RNA sequence: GCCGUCGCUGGCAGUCGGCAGAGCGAGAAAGAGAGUGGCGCGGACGCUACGCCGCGACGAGUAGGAGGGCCGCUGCGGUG
RNA sequence: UGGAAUGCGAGUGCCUAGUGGGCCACUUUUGGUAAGCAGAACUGGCGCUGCGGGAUGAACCGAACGCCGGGUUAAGGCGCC
RNA sequence: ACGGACCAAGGAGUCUAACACGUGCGCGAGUCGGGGGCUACGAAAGCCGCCGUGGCGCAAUGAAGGUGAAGGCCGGCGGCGCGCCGCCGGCCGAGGUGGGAUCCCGAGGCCUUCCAGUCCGCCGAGGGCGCACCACCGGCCCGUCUCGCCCGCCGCGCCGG
RNA sequence: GGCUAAAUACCGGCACGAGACCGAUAGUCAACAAGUACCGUAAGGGAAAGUUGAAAAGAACUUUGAAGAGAGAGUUCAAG
């Protein structure tokens, strides 16, 4: 094994932004959060905002 | 979040040129699509007999 | 991903995908582009025709920026200015003609391929083509030169 | 879809305050788990050290 | 080190494994090869075929109006033949009704 | 939407369990516990659950109200039925039919509210 | 977490700085908690164990309410020998059973002219941390 | 035993899309339903094109959609595409168009909406006209890719204008022997 | 009889239920269409649609190719 | 009246491993006295291929292979093995 | 014919660069910050657009000097001798033929006692616009050859078109 | 004829931190009294070798035999 193996990958900026918007649009769905395992059976509302 | 990404008509203000990715389909409820009189009327009767 | 590669289904078969009769030896044809004239002539003639020989004059100290000339076609000439300049010249009535400066956009020569919209223009450019200038006269317009 | 509700900020005592905020448009972008995964399994190859 | 010199043994079967197919017969075959002077006069004929258009309609519409005075001038056994008519789903609908009423 | 988050949950859930050539699901309000679009208790807009009552006897029924959809706290309504084995199996039946509330789940709900009574009788 | 970029979170480096520690560092390593009767007196939670201190074992086979004098501090084995924690060899002679300082609580310090300096030091920096917090 | 040959028993058509996105795998569900439950050979073609790879459904240009929707007769119809609708900056006038495609670039949405046309989706189309009555199927140029210029008869062959694979193109890159009638020959 | 592959680019979102009416196998291109005048509250299963179901034909194989492995090994991000 | 019969869905495009020592047989066939020899032509095989027969067997006769029950055959057989 | 007494562990298509095709994804006549700069895990992630220089794509052709990608009809004027040539002012406008998924029209018809009788649908003789693609013929750009006649003007020419 | 920092390089040295690396036939040849033992006249070549248990509590004492060795007994959660 050598040290000039390709370790790092580069991604398109518009695709990192597509992935961020897709990872935020999926955090406001009770099913997609209760399926990741979180125990949110008593959260009053999913987009939980505080003062 | 809107000044960062922003709705599909107002661009992103904090980024240089970014608009939320468009949608490949709007009414993602293909149950409501499929049991709708528009489409329900344009179908042949189901051949649900096993021979 | 090695787990997706082809050497993961090749465990247990003796020749490892490479032949029983003719083994996978090291260099059974020479290294690199060897035998371009002797035993790889059918390939260097069926796929790289004209690869062998000289032609033309040499140019020792070539500098790639004396011969700099990026071109723009007439079809996308009207794309250099904003939209409220072409429609402002549409709604215009005093015959005024917008000045499209091309060397300001980054092209030196103007080639004339596409159609033009019927309105006058003043195309500032460094070099013009005969047809590019005729398509501009035939619509009414001036071909300014800029050194 | 297009209907963006009005989430309600929750005071620090748990009870909902009076402040409301209209759901930013990011929370309706398309959910693309394949894009999210492709981006994650490439971006986390970058924090890796040689060996 | 004498090796077999030449053979055609398996060849007549490799040829037929993927068939021997006649070439693709298309209409409007190419005009490459035809003699220059002839194909130059055929190009001068095409270049000017349009020159006799407004005279060509004057005849096509003529014989098409004449097409009006052309066309508007002219303008095994009884048993199994009756059963093959009663047994027609559409044509035999009334010979069938005449029998259905028959049993009343 | 339902079909969207089902096309997201069909394989990368945390309740999904895959061993012994079977594939069940441990969702809260999944009755028959099997991984399917129809019986999943988190994807739809109206689900039904039939749990055992917290004490010894009874069967709780958990309907998901329509109005509150992004409010997990005030989303589900629960009704404890501590009655005989038949009145409760005609009350769940009415709760589902007369309300016309996800009606293809009724026989599953009866079979589950019978499994609970059977697993709450005195053993032998 | 720890954010000091100069401290070693590695495992084997702490497991090596432990076993190859010099004696004067092994003295701090072999500290021991104070009993809740001297804690409310001195405002000090633990002290490097000295020789002539009275102690009481809390974890192990010899854990109880018997108090004993620390007989010796065998800092090379990271252990101490107390008065009446012992064992009988096969022939009959008795040996002192070593106890780790962390499994034993001190009930009467041996106040020197230096253990008083260490106590007042800890007390000082503790009132300084209480004023730093309150 | 029977003396058949199984060389061609496995038909190689695409049974389903190779992508794993779920806004396409739902369109393909709706259109596979329409395809099997209707007798319209439109839905079957839309489905068979929703399977096709990204190189078989190429982009359309706005100008080519203009000249393909200006043909006489097909007015007030919806232009259906399965690929994407790219912009065409070398066209100045845009009419009103009812369109339905998978993608419309952010500088062609502008032009079409400022013109006044509609931009439907495939679900909107399936609800408007299930059997696809009033539509115009289109598809972008397939031989537009530069790849199709190296395909055909190999270069260095009488009358084979096929493009070769060369590092760079210049005076001294494959211009000497199999090209000059002087140096050797040419084809 | 059973297993599998291929083909039918086959069928099934119709589980349309007291807001009900339970059908599309039958030789013959197309509507169990509209209007316009002469008690007892009841009804199995299904549908991870990447799923389920029905039909036929087929099943050798070195070199080689491809696919599918809820076959196996070690570590990483999540999750049980 | 889609202009003979019978049969059968075809057409097209890229990328491509392995191979480039062959051998046998019916028939024709060249050198050689001939050869289990050297060399060609057509087709079928062995190689890459089991199974029943030929006692045995690369190539001969029958016949080509998923795993099984019943029935019937091929080529070969039916004093005993 | 060669290797092999036995058992355990180790043991052989790897990584980098280039290229080609296929495939998934984002954007799309654009595209990309990879270099640089700004803001524990984090050496990560985010951001820059007056950081897109530059690469590749958007134009080819010639060794080069260089050049560099539809036209037609209409009048009016000069010339040759009814056409053409040039010259000004009009309007029309990006080829065609064959096959061609798809879509469009629709003669006629799809039953319930009997005729007229509208809306909704569906089938359908025949007729159309024709996607992509394929064949063929034209057209356009550069190099080259042949035969020719004309137009341009600050420099009239071994000039330019 | 002459001088000149910064941006630049660093598998040696001192002091550090980390790891999708190997985990004692691997990882340095060398986790251990390793460039040691050993070989060679020399230049040089150059290994094998980690693990009782929490703590030695490392079996007192009795007994056969000259002893090694046993048979009892005891320590330990366990001498398996
Ligand atoms: Mg093999
Ligand atoms: Mg080998
Ligand atoms: Mg291979
Ligand atoms: Mg080879
Ligand atoms: Mg090799
Ligand atoms: Mg030679
Ligand atoms: Mg068979
Ligand atoms: Mg097989
Ligand atoms: Mg040979
Ligand atoms: Mg060989
Ligand atoms: Mg021989
Ligand atoms: Mg021979
Ligand atoms: Mg063999
Ligand atoms: Mg062989
Ligand atoms: Mg074979
Ligand atoms: Mg055989
Ligand atoms: Mg014999
Ligand atoms: Mg050998
Ligand atoms: Mg041997
Ligand atoms: Mg091994
Ligand atoms: Mg290749
Ligand atoms: Mg590609
Ligand atoms: Mg370059
Ligand atoms: Mg770190
Ligand atoms: Mg070892
Ligand atoms: Mg070892
Ligand atoms: Mg070991
Ligand atoms: Mg070692
Ligand atoms: Mg070992």
Which residues, 6 or more positions from F106, have their beta carbon under 8 angstroms from its beta carbon? F92, F93, F96, F97
Pick from C103, C146, C97: which is nearest to C117 by CA? C97
Dihedral sign from CA coordinates of H164, H166, H170, H173 = negative
Nearest to D7 among A3, A19, A49 (CB): A49
Question: Any idea what DSSP says for residue B44?
Answer: P
Q: Who's near E7: CB < 8 A, 6+ residues apart?
A: none
Cα-based distances in Å from F121 to E101, F31, H112: 67, 21, 70
Experimental technique: cryo-EM
Do H and C make contact via 3 or more CB pairs under 8 A? The reply is yes
- Residue H167: nearest ligand to its CA? 23
Q: Do C135 and C77 touch, CB atoms closer than 8 A?
A: no
Distance CA F86, CA F93 (A): 10
| Alpha-carbon dihedral angle through residues H50, H52, H58, H63, given to the nearest 10 degrees | -40
Residue listed under structure tokens 């790849």: H147
Nucleotide nearest to D50 (CA to C1'): L19
Rounded Cα distance between F45 and F34, Å, is 19
Locus of tokens 């990715």: B21
Please give, rounded to a whole number of angstroms, the shortest distance from the CA of F10 to a CA of chain B: 16
Collapsed DSSP state (helix, strand, coil) of residue C73: strand
Residues H44 and H36: their CA atoms lie apart, in Å, by 8
The CA-CA-CA angle for residues H22, H24, H25, to 5°, reads 60
- Mapped onto helix, strand or coil, the DSSP state of residue G107 is strand
- Cβ contact H121:H75 at 8 Å: no
* Sequence-separated contacts (24+) of C95-101 with Cβ below 8 Å: C95/C120, C97/C121, C97/C122, C97/C141, C97/C142, C98/C122, C99/C124, C99/C144, C100/C124, C101/C146
**Residue A32 · residue F5 · CB < 8 Å:** yes
Closest by CA to H136, choosing from H53, H54, H72, H80, is H80
| Beta-bridge mates of residue F113 | none
Chain L nucleotides close to protein (CB under 7 A) are: 16-21, 54-61, 73-75, 77
Backbone phi, then psi, for H88, in 5-degree steps? -140, 95
Report residue F57 CA to chain centroid gap: 18
Alpha-carbon span A42 to H130, nearest angstrom: 43
Q: Which of C87, A22, H159, H96 is nearest to D38 (CA)?
A: A22
The nucleotides of chain I lying under 7 Å from a protein CB are 5-19, 23-25, 28, 30, 32, 41-50, 53-55, 57-59, 61-73, 77-80
H helices of chain F, where? 2-12, 88-97, 106-118
In chain K, which nucleotides are within 7 Å of a protein Cβ? 13-17, 19-34, 40-49, 53, 57-59, 61, 63-65, 67-70, 93-95, 97-98, 101-105, 111, 121-123, 128-139, 141, 161
Strand partners, G31: G48
> F85 is written with which tokens?
């084995």
Three-state secondary structure readout of H103-131? EECCCHHHHHHHHCCEEECHHHHHHHCCC
Q: How far is CA C109 from CA C71, C102, C114, C129, in A?
A: 5, 8, 15, 8
Query: Looking at the DSSP assignment, which residues form a beta bridge with residue H120?
Result: H100
Residue H107: how many other CB atoms lie within 10 Å: 11
Q: Can you tell me whether residue F94 is helix, strand or coil?
A: helix
**Enclosing H/E stretch for C72:** strand C71-73
Q: Which residues touch strand L (CB under 7 A)?
A: A 1; D 41, 44-45, 47-49, 51; G 5-10, 13, 60-61, 77, 87, 89-92, 95, 97-98
Query: Alpha helices of chain H — where are they, by DSSP H?
Result: 27-37, 43-51, 62-69, 108-115, 122-128
A1 three-state secondary structure: coil
* C4 C-beta less than 7 Å away from strand I: no
Residue C45 sits at φ, ψ, to 5 deg, of: -110, -30
DSSP G40-90: HHH--SEEE--SS-EEEE-SSTT-SS-EEEEEEEETTTTEEEETT-EEE-S
Phi/psi of residue A18, nearest 5 degrees: -60, -40
Cβ atoms C97, C89 nearer than 8 A: yes
- Name the 3-class secondary structure at E53: coil
Q: Is the dihedral of CA H139, H145, H147, H150 positive or negative?
A: positive
- Which backbone phi and psi does D33 adopt, to 5 degrees? -65, -30
* CA distance linking residue C51 with residue C40, whole number of Å: 12
Q: Subunits that touch chain C (at least 3 Cβ pairs < 8 angstroms)?
A: H
Helix (H) / strand (E) element for B32: namely: helix B30-34
Enter the resolution in angstroms.
3.9
Give the per-residue SS3 of chain D. Answer: CCCCCEEEEECCCCCEEEEEEECCHHHHCCCCHHHHHHHHHHHCCCCCCCC
Residue burial E8-34, b: 16+ Cβ < 10 Å; e: rest:
eeeeeeeeeeeeeeeeeeeeeeeeeee
């Amino acid at each position: 094994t050598k040290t000039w193996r390709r370790w790092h990958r580069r991604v398109n900026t518009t695709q990192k932004r597509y992935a961020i918007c897709s990872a935020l649009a999926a955090s406001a769905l009770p099913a997609l959060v209760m399926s990741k395992g979180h125990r949110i059976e008593e959260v009053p509302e999913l987009p939980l905002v505080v003062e | 979040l809107d000044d960062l990404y922003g709705t599909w008509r107002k661009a992103a203000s904090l980024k240089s040129n970014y608009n939320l990715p468009m949608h490949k389909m709007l009414n993602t409820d293909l149950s409501r699509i499929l049991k709708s009189p528009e489409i329900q009327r344009a179908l042949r009767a189901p051949r649900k007999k096993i021979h | 991903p090695s787990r997706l590669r082809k050497t993961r289904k090749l465990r247990g078969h003796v020749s490892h995908g490479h032949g029983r009769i003719g083994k996978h030896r090291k260099h059974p044809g020479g290294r690199g582009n060897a035998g371009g004239m002797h035993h790889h002539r059918i390939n260097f003639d069926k796929y790289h025709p004209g690869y062998f020989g000289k032609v033309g004059m040499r140019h020792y100290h070539l500098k790639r920026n004396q011969s700099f000339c990026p071109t723009v076609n007439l079809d996308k000439l009207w794309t250099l200015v904003s939209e409220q300049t072409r429609v402002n010249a549409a709604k215009n009535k005093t015959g005024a003609a917008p000045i499209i400066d091309v060397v300001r956009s980054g092209y030196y020569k103007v080639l004339g391929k596409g159609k033009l919209p019927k309105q006058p223009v003043i195309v500032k450019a460094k070099f013009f083509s005969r047809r590019a200038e005729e398509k501009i006269k035939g619509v009414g317009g001036a071909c300014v030169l800029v050194a | 879809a297009c209907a963006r509700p009005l989430i309600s900020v929750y005071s620090e005592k748990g009870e909902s305050s009076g402040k409301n905020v209209t759901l930013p448009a990011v929370f309706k972008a398309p959910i693309r788990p394949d894009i999210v995964n492709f981006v994650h399994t490439n971006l986390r190859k970058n924090n890796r050290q040689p060996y | 080190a004498k090796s077999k010199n030449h053979t055609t043994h398996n060849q007549s079967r490799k040829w037929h494994r993927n068939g021997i197919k006649k070439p693709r017969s298309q209409r409007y075959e190419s005009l490459k090869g035809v003699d220059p002077k002839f194909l130059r006069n055929m190009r001068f004929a095409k270049k000017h075929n349009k020159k006799g258009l407004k005279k060509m309609q004057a005849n096509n519409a003529k014989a098409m109006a004449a097409r009006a005075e052309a066309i508007k001038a002219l303008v095994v056994s009884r048993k199994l033949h009756r059963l093959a008519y009663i047994a027609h789903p559409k044509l035999g609908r009334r010979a069938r009704a005449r029998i259905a009423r028959g049993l009343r | 939407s339902a079909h969207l988050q089902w096309m997201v949950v069909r394989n990368c859930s945390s309740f999904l369990i895959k061993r012994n050539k079977q594939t069940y699901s441990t969702e809260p309000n999944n009755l028959k516990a099997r991984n399917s679009f129809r019986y999943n208790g988190l994807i739809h807009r109206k689900t039904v659950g039939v749990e055992p009552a917290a004490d010894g006897k009874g069967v709780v029924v958990v309907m998901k109200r329509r109005s509150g959809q992004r409010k997990p706290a005030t989303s589900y309504v629960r009704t404890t039925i501590n009655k005989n084995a038949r009145a409760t199996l005609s009350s769940i039946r009415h709760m589902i039919r007369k309300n016309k509330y996800h009606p293809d789940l009724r026989m599953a709900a009866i079979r589950r509210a019978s499994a609970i009574l059977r697993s709450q009788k005195p053993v032998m | 977490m720890k954010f000091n970029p100069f401290v070693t979170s590695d495992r084997s480096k702490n497991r090596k700085r432990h076993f190859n520690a010099p004696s004067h560092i092994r003295r701090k390593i072999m500290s021991s908690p104070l009993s809740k009767e001297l804690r409310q007196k001195y405002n000090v939670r633990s002290m490097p164990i000295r020789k002539d201190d009275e102690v009481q074992v809390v974890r192990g086979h010899y854990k109880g309410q018997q108090i004993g004098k620390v007989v010796q501090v065998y800092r090379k084995k990271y252990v101490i020998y107390i008065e009446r924690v012992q064992r009988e060899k096969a022939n009959g002679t008795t040996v002192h059973v070593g106890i780790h300082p962390s499994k034993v609580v001190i009930t009467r310090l041996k106040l020197d002219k230096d253990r008083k300096k260490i106590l007042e030091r800890k007390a000082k920096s503790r009132q300084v941390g209480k004023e730093k917090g309150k | 035993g029977v003396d058949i040959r199984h060389n061609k028993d496995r038909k190689v058509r695409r049974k389903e899309p190779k992508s794993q996105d779920i806004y396409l795998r739902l369109l393909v569900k709706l259109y596979r339903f329409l395809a099997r439950r209707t007798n319209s050979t439109f839905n079957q073609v839309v489905l068979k094109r929703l399977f096709m790879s990204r190189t078989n459904r190429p982009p359309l240009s706005l100008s080519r959609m203009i000249r393909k929707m200006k043909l006489p007769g097909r007015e007030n119809k919806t232009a259906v595409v399965v690929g994407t609708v790219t912009d065409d900056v070398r066209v100045q006038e845009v009419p009103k168009l009812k369109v339905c495609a998978l993608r419309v670039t952010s500088r062609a949405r502008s032009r079409i909406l400022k013109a006044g046309g509609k931009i439907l989706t495939f679900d909107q189309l399936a609800l408007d006209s299930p059997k696809g009555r009033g539509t115009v199927l289109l598809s972008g140029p397939r031989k537009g890719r530069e790849v199709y210029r190296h395909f055909g008869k190999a270069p260095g062959t009488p009358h084979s204008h096929t493009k070769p694979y060369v590092r760079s193109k210049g005076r001294k890159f494959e211009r000497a022997r199999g090209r000059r009638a002087s140096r050797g020959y040419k084809n």
